[PDB]
Amino acid sequence: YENERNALNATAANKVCGLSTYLKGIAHRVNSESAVVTEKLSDLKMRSIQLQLSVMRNRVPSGEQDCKDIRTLLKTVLRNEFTFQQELEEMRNASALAAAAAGIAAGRLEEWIFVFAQAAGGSSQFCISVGTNIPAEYNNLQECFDGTIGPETLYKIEDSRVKESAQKSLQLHEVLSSISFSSLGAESIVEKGENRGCNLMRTADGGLLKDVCLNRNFTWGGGVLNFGYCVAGNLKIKGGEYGDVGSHDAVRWTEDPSKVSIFKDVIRLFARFQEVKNAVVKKIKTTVDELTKCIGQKEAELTNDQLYEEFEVIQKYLWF
Amino acid sequence: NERNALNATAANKVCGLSTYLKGIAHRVNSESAVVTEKLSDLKMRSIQLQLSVMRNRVPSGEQDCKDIRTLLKTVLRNEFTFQQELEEMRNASALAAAAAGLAAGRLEEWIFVFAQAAGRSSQFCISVGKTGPAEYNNLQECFDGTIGPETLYKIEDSRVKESAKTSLQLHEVLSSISFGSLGVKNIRGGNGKDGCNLVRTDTDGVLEGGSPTRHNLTWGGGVMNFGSYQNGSMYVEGGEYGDATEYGAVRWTEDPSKVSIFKDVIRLFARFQEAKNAVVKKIKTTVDELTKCIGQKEAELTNDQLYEEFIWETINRLELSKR
Amino acid sequence: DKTVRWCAVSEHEATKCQSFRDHMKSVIPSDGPSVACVKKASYLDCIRAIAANEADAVTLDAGLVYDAYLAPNNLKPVVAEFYGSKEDPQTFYYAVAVVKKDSGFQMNQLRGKKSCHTGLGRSAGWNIPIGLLYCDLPEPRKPLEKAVANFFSGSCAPCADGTDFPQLCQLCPGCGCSTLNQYFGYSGAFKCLKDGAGDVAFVKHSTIFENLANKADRDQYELLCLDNTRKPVDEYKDCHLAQVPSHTVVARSMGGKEDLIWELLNQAQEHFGKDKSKEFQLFSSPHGKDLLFKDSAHGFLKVPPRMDAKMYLGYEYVTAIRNLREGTCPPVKWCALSHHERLKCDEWSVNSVGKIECVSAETTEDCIAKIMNGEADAMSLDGGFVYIAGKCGLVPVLAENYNKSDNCEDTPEAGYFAVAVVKKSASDLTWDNLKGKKSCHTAVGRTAGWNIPMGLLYNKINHCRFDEFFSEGCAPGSKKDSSLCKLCMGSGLNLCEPNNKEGYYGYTGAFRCLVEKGDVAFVKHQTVPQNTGGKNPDPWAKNLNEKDYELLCLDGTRKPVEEYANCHLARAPNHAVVTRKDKEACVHKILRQQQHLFKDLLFRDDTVCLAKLHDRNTYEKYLGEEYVKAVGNLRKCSTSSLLEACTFRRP
Ligand SMILES: *[C@@H]1O[C@H](CO)[C@@H](O[C@@H]2O[C@H](CO)[C@@H](O[C@H]3O[C@H](CO)[C@@H](O)[C@H](O)[C@@H]3O)[C@H](O)[C@H]2NC(C)=O)[C@H](O)[C@H]1NC(C)=O
Ligand SMILES: *[C@@H]1O[C@H](CO)[C@@H](O[C@@H]2O[C@H](CO)[C@@H](O[C@H]3O[C@H](CO)[C@@H](O)[C@H](O)[C@@H]3O)[C@H](O)[C@H]2NC(C)=O)[C@H](O)[C@H]1NC(C)=O
Ligand SMILES: *[C@@H]1O[C@H](CO)[C@@H](O[C@@H]2O[C@H](CO)[C@@H](O)[C@H](O)[C@H]2NC(C)=O)[C@H](O)[C@H]1NC(C)=O
Numbered sequence A: 001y002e003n004e005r006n007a008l009n010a011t012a013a014n015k016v017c018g019l020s021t022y023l024k025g026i027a028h029r030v031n032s033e034s035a036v037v038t039e040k041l042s043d044l045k046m047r048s049i050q051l052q053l054s055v056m057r058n059r060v061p062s063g064e065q066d067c068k069d070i071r072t073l074l075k076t077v078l079r080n081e082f083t084f085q086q087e088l089e090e091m092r093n094a095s096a097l098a099a100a101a102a103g104i105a106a107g108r109l110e111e112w113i114f115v116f117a118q119a120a121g122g123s124s125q126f127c128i129s130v131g132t133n134i135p136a137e138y139n140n141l142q143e144c145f146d147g148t149i150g151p152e153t154l155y156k157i158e159d160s161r162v163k164e165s166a167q168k169s170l171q172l173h174e175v176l177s178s179i180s181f182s183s184l185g186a187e188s189i190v191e192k193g194e195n196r197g198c199n200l201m202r203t204a205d206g207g208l209l210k211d212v213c214l215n216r217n218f219t220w221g222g223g224v225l226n227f228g229y230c231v232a233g234n235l236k237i238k239g240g241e242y243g244d245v246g247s248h249d250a251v252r253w254t255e256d257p258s259k260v261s262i263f264k265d266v267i268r269l270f271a272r273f274q275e276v277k278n279a280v281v282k283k284i285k286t287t288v289d290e291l292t293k294c295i296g297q298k299e300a301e302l303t304n305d306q307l308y309e310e311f312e313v314i315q316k317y318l319w320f
Numbered sequence B: 001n002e003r004n005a006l007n008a009t010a011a012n013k014v015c016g017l018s019t020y021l022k023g024i025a026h027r028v029n030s031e032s033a034v035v036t037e038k039l040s041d042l043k044m045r046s047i048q049l050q051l052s053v054m055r056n057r058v059p060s061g062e063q064d065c066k067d068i069r070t071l072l073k074t075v076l077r078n079e080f081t082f083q084q085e086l087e088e089m090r091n092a093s094a095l096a097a098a099a100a101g102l103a104a105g106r107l108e109e110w111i112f113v114f115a116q117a118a119g120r121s122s123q124f125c126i127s128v129g130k131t132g133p134a135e136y137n138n139l140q141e142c143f144d145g146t147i148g149p150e151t152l153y154k155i156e157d158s159r160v161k162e163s164a165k166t167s168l169q170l171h172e173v174l175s176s177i178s179f180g181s182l183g184v185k186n187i188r189g190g191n192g193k194d195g196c197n198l199v200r201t202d203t204d205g206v207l208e209g210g211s212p213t214r215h216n217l218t219w220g221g222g223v224m225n226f227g228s229y230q231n232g233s234m235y236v237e238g239g240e241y242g243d244a245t246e247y248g249a250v251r252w253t254e255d256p257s258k259v260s261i262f263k264d265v266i267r268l269f270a271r272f273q274e275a276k277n278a279v280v281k282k283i284k285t286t287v288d289e290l291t292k293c294i295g296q297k298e299a300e301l302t303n304d305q306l307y308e309e310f311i312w313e314t315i316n317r318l319e320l321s322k323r
Numbered sequence C: 001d002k003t004v005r006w007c008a009v010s011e012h013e014a015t016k017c018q019s020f021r022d023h024m025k026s027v028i029p030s031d032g033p034s035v036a037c038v039k040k041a042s043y044l045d046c047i048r049a050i051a052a053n054e055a056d057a058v059t060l061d062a063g064l065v066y067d068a069y070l071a072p073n074n075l076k077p078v079v080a081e082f083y084g085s086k087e088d089p090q091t092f093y094y095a096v097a098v099v100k101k102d103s104g105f106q107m108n109q110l111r112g113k114k115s116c117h118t119g120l121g122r123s124a125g126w127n128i129p130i131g132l133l134y135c136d137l138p139e140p141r142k143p144l145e146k147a148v149a150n151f152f153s154g155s156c157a158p159c160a161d162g163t164d165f166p167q168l169c170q171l172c173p174g175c176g177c178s179t180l181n182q183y184f185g186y187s188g189a190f191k192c193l194k195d196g197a198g199d200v201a202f203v204k205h206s207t208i209f210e211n212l213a214n215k216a217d218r219d220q221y222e223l224l225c226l227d228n229t230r231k232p233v234d235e236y237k238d239c240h241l242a243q244v245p246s247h248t249v250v251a252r253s254m255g256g257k258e259d260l261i262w263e264l265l266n267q268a269q270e271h272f273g274k275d276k277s278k279e280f281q282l283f284s285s286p287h288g289k290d291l292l293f294k295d296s297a298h299g300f301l302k303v304p305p306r307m308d309a310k311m312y313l314g315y316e317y318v319t320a321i322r323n324l325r326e327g328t329c330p331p332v333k334w335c336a337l338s339h340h341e342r343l344k345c346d347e348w349s350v351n352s353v354g355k356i357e358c359v360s361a362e363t364t365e366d367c368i369a370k371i372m373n374g375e376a377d378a379m380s381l382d383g384g385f386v387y388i389a390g391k392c393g394l395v396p397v398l399a400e401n402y403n404k405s406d407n408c409e410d411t412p413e414a415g416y417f418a419v420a421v422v423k424k425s426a427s428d429l430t431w432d433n434l435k436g437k438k439s440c441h442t443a444v445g446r447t448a449g450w451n452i453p454m455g456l457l458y459n460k461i462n463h464c465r466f467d468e469f470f471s472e473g474c475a476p477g478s479k480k481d482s483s484l485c486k487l488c489m490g491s492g493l494n495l496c497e498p499n500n501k502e503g504y505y506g507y508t509g510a511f512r513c514l515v516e517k518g519d520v521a522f523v524k525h526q527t528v529p530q531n532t533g534g535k536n537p538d539p540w541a542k543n544l545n546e547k548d549y550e551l552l553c554l555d556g557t558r559k560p561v562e563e564y565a566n567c568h569l570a571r572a573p574n575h576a577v578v579t580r581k582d583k584e585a586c587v588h589k590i591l592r593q594q595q596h597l598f599k600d601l602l603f604r605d606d607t608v609c610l611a612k613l614h615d616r617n618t619y620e621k622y623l624g625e626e627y628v629k630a631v632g633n634l635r636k637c638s639t640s641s642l643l644e645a646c647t648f649r650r651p
């Protein structure tokens, strides 16, 4: 009853690992989304070479929709060749950071669960349960491990499912909400009313410390699982954060993952990248829209391959 | 039997490594900012050369200035290839960043769990010599203020930003946590009665009324390796993940390059660095060909005056063909 | 320092304490213990002050002693108040369920009966019975009063609101909280039964003797036991609901001045205790009644150190209070001796597919303690440990059979034989000629290895110093600084350890000791044949033959190992599976079920099967009158911290 040491449910463990591999996938996600911008930029370079060929034919549509000033048209064309790469640098700077910050959160969650998964002993005592007198194994912990529980069996950033998790159409906010207290349910987090001898979840004497309660509050994850200074027996889980553990009794699983220490920076820096990504994309859009109204129909219907052959021809002509 | 703890120096060196790995994100960003400086310089030079060609000021070729026709064709195509190589490089920059992040997160969780595992009556998991608990005053490579989740170092924190600025290489920092560099003196600490269960695998340690016999518990990715029946005495020997025995000593990594989490970091940071060096060499060689055939008049021309005089000339040469 | 900060809950208690300090200062030297007093609002603020290292000690009733042991306080019983003579101290009271002779209902049949309680919220009259019957109560069990009212067909629970719960006052309308209510208190609860108003009275063991002076009158009453049987009112020690400590001094589990409080209170009872000084009285004051300590107390006794609040309060009391506090309501955990036994137990856990579970402990008495409190459910024990375990409240359920039988399961055995093994070469050795020689014991407290040869030795030398009698030897469990740990083979810390980590522990281990270091080994009759003649593949045993070993007969005679039948020290009771009384049926069922399906780890390796017990379901009954008497004779020479603790509750 008081000597009672509950274990974490495998389902709760898998959901943490789930988020963990999504976070490992943020690197590939930024790379994919960044790649779209460069495709949109490549189209701008191809369409501006279409304009320069129209400038050279002197067969620039006499669109009263401001194609009369040849000077400022070409000035912005050359300017673009430099203005864009320094704003694209800004978005990649934010991509690296979000990718890393996410990686930190992933590792924090991974260590936690992996240590709990290793704290298993033949029968009766363990930290991740499945209801039986047998601890949870790699088949139960499918989102955590790719086989026999160990350090090389955990998912790496270049691994199989990390890459496919990056194309899951799931947004950060949704995945984060998945591990909230509501989305998990009190019951599905901890295996209550069972003594599985897991000391990693006891702040009271004979838990983390053998003779005393802790001098302070304790947290697994970065505020995912929270404990009071003297938690013993049947784990009284309620929704809340590290700040919400007022009593010695208190066990609190996060209700708002954005309030969790480790997720804060991921949210922030992914938002930075997205903010920039989308501002660059609108810059390209407004520019493409202003150049297109000046490109001549003869050069417009011109295919990418022969567009570059013909450019060289008049280019070398005018130079000499 | 003695009940010892992990010493603050071991915790601090592990923390240090973690803040270096968080620094890798900023390191790749700086290194990539160097490249785009060099690539912009290349794009500058090509306009300058184009202007000299139109103004016929390309010097009496001491080098191959006689065939600017071909040496400009190749440059306008090389400018395009470098942009695709840049993106391959940046792809690697984000993966290196993330992989390093992972490694840092794993270590941070480990040390932070030991740092919090501290109570009254000189009972703790992190020591300051033969006493403790270690507070935020000790463990300054780990924390900002009193031990908590909000006082650990974050990616944009000054400490991580300043660590990114150093001339220290990955291998150097990795070695700083090896059993050789640390030593038994710097790993085991505390009094013989600090009751730290995180460091005991024998009965009533990590598990109550049992031991983790199914798995050989490893903290980090194989930094601190336990077996099934460790006293909690903090008896340490050098070794890797598979090396831990039932009644033997804790195995502290002899070679941190052999550890699971550092495996992808070494690999992906190297992938970036290799790709970076290759692009930088290519930009150098092409710039060096261009800077030869420009001329002092057009060479001095930069930014707004460059475009201004380049457009001035393109409009002039176009009116020449029209007549 | 040597000062004890005492907690006082009132102004009158704080002043009696100033008087306590001042009078102590006047009789104890500078070097010795001293008192200092601290005032707090209630008992809970006192428990809190101790935990917060502000005060050091306070005396509490069992109910608060439970609250004090709970986190974050983690306090413990250090000193106990006793009542009556020094010879028979009355430290605990027994909560009983008194009924009338021939009423024909058991504990499980209490639903629909008429109950008499001392009062609502009282220990013996409410908290203990209603705590135990909690799960027998109808749903919803909250409010508790409503549920109790719907369980019994009419009650008398004084101090309860009859306006809300009228069924609780059916026998004493109004539930009067004064002695004016005829059925109030212990006496009244008994009167409620005596007058035939109720069917059961929840009282103390004493209540019948306090209300009926004639032995013939008391004979017409019986007690309800938890095993669903009845027993006479004079058999309360064998038939009760709970065993409750009267008044207990508490202090911190770690960093608590346990020894300093004992020293101060032992010195205090000697100087100002019962019939000692006219100047100051420890158990009396003009400022009020029961200040700091109960006025009825006769003095203090030290609580055995092995004793923890749970064990001290007892399983029954703890279970009653847990049920009431928690409200939690709807396989066998086998205890293993070190990692060797645990490894085997684990195989058994998975193979049995969630029928048997495991728990580890380094000693057998640590395991007995685990069974006792509830951490574990059952374990197979040697005869000597069945005696200790039984004296701790546990019961045997199955016996280990070793002889080849047709129906082994229902054919009981008289036991194995304890023998003294010598080499054929050491012809100078006689049963009497063992003084100043080297001995090899299985372990201390074991049948063949300790209890039988050391009992026969104590009945001759009439003293407990066995380390003086022998030159050296190996008896795992002995003090590591004794001569009886000098011949052990355990690696550093593992030397003289009572488990398989020590190489000379057990029957095979003691035989190995005789061959390698000693000159006499105390084992079972079948130890020499089981290891000799290549039967043991181990390097030390591989080349040994039983022709080279003899037996020491009690008549100073020597005979071969096969002639054990007429050259044995004594018959030894077979090893038996012990458990908590409240587990007998399930252990018996699963073990029989398991037995038909599936070094001496968990059980002796010469076990052919697990045999049923009938009338012999008590330690006295199983071990037999002869063995119990022989082990009892060695109580003066006991080393067991567990036995010392278990006998503090039931000597
Ligand atoms: C039980 O706790 C013990 C301390 O409380 C711990 O003792 C340690 O035992 C080892 C034995 O290997 C000693 O190390 C010795 O081993 C090397 C081998 O290369 C020898 O050259 C040296 O003599 C060396 O001293 C340790 O010194 C000793 N530790 C201490 C602090 O005294 C046990 O290991 C613990 N048991 C288990 C199973 O963990
Ligand atoms: C940077 O990494 C990006 C992913 O993190 C990557 O984007 C993706 O590029 C691949 C090809 O490299 C595209 O996949 C297509 O091609 C493969 C060829 O085997 C097919 O199997 C697929 O079905 C698919 O047609 C992805 O579509 C593309 N992702 C997105 C969303 O655009 C970049 O290409 C990498 N950039 C560099 C320069 O290395
Ligand atoms: C890209 O990240 C870098 C920092 O890693 C930003 O700053 C450049 O790099 C160092 C940082 O110490 C400075 O000395 C340089 O002067 C910065 N600029 C350049 C062009 O190298 C960089 O500015 C971030 N990206 C953007 C577009 O702001």
Ligand SMILES: *[C@@H]1O[C@H](CO)[C@@H](O)[C@H](O)[C@H]1NC(C)=O
Pocket: A009, A010, A011, A012, A129, A130, A131, A187, A188, A189, A190, A191
């Ligand atoms: C999660 O928790 C426990 C684990 O033993 C169990 O009830 C189940 O697997 C999960 N919850 C539910 C109600 O399905």
Ligand SMILES: *[C@@H]1O[C@H](CO)[C@@H](O)[C@H](O)[C@H]1NC(C)=O
Pocket: A215, A216, A217, A228, A229, A242, A243, A244, A245, A246
């Ligand atoms: C968590 O524990 C600390 C240390 O005992 C305590 O002071 C604090 O009040 C608790 N947390 C909160 C935010 O209440």
Ligand SMILES: *[C@@H]1O[C@H](CO)[C@@H](O)[C@H](O)[C@H]1NC(C)=O
Pocket: B007, B008, B009, B010, B127, B128, B129, B130, B185, B186, B187, B189
């Ligand atoms: C850690 O180890 C070193 C060497 O043993 C020593 O400084 C001390 O014991 C510990 N504490 C600190 C402050 O490093």
Ligand SMILES: *[C@@H]1O[C@H](CO)[C@@H](O)[C@H](O)[C@H]1NC(C)=O
Pocket: B213, B214, B215, B216, B227, B242, B243, B244, B245, B246
């Ligand atoms: C380490 O783990 C593996 C698990 O199969 C096993 O060799 C053993 O249990 C452990 N210890 C040793 C000595 O390798």
Ligand SMILES: [Fe+3]
Pocket: C382, C383, C446, C447, C448, C449, C572
């Ligand atoms: Fe025996």
